[PDB]
Amino acid sequence: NEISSDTLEQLYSLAFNQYQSGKYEDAHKVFQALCVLDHYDSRFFLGLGACRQAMGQYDLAIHSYEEGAVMDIKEPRFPFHAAECLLQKGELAEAESGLFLAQELIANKPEFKELSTRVSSMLEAIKLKKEM
Amino acid sequence: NEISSDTLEQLYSLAFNQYQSGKYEDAHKVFQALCVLDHYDSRFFLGLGACRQAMGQYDLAIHSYEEGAVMDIKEPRFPFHAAECLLQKGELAEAESGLFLAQELIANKPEFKELSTRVSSMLEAIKLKKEM
Structure with missing residues (x-):
């Protein structure tokens, strides 16, 4: 070290x-x-x-x-990118939970404004397909 | 770099x-x-x-x-250790050739006296089992 x-x-x-x-x-x-x-x-x-x-x-x-x-x-990017991978594995439920967490870790902090839009968008994708 | x-x-x-x-x-x-x-x-x-x-x-x-x-x-240790691995794969012919090469790369240089003894010994193992 x-x-x-x-x-x-x-x-x-x-x-x-x-x-x-x-x-x-x-x-x-x-x-x-x-x-x-x-x-x-x-x-x-x-x-x-x-x-x-x-x-x-x-x-x-x-x-x-x-x-x-x-x-x-406290870092949002960990649950976020993990959610991206989970989506590629076709595991949307696991991905949504991660996205919820990242969203909670971001907490409307302006510095993550772009990351947030991406989270809101990925949730909306999951949400649309999930709600039928 | x-x-x-x-x-x-x-x-x-x-x-x-x-x-x-x-x-x-x-x-x-x-x-x-x-x-x-x-x-x-x-x-x-x-x-x-x-x-x-x-x-x-x-x-x-x-x-x-x-x-x-x-x-x-020019480095003997490459053919030498590769020969060791080939022995673990059970490929004695490939190992022997590598050992012959290392042996030729060493060329009786005193600095590799210990490495040489090991090469002579591994060859003798292969040689004994091979000669029946």
Whole structure:
């Protein structure tokens, strides 16, 4: 853990850029390594989960999002992205609960205004198909 | 690649220690990340391969040993450890060829005297069972 400096930031910035560049397998390797250097840092679990989600590895994505939630139970993005994966698994009920949670974690905070619209929209999709 | 300093050494030293400590899954994560920072460094492929071998992931070990050999065709340890994995797969002929190669790569260099004895011994095992 502490044999390393804030190089974690350099590595994190690298893995971040790789994810943006579509190199998900490489970003994944770096994020996974960061999860070792500091397994209490939810940024790394959020990133790792995103890489797995980007490669359509949904179960693994949900696993990472769950680990990271433990490290930050106030963070809306964990239940949110996990809900996205659950939708891809065709599990709408599980997804809706996650979306309800993210929605409650967001609590009308302006900083998540865009994330909220997406949550309201995904709920409305589930809601429309569910209500017949 | 070059967004990083010789921190590669700090990470390498960490992954090395983890392997010694029996934390192969963690060492694996770090080594794999190093293989990204500098995919021309055979030290990382040798280490990664060792982690996979240590977890009995033999096919993956052989894959890493092959990648690293490309980066260092003079290194005896690549054909050597790959031969060890091939023995665990029960493929003695493939293992013997690798051992012959490592033996030729060593070329009676004193620095590999211990590795050589092990090669001579593994060959003698194969040789005894093969000669009936």
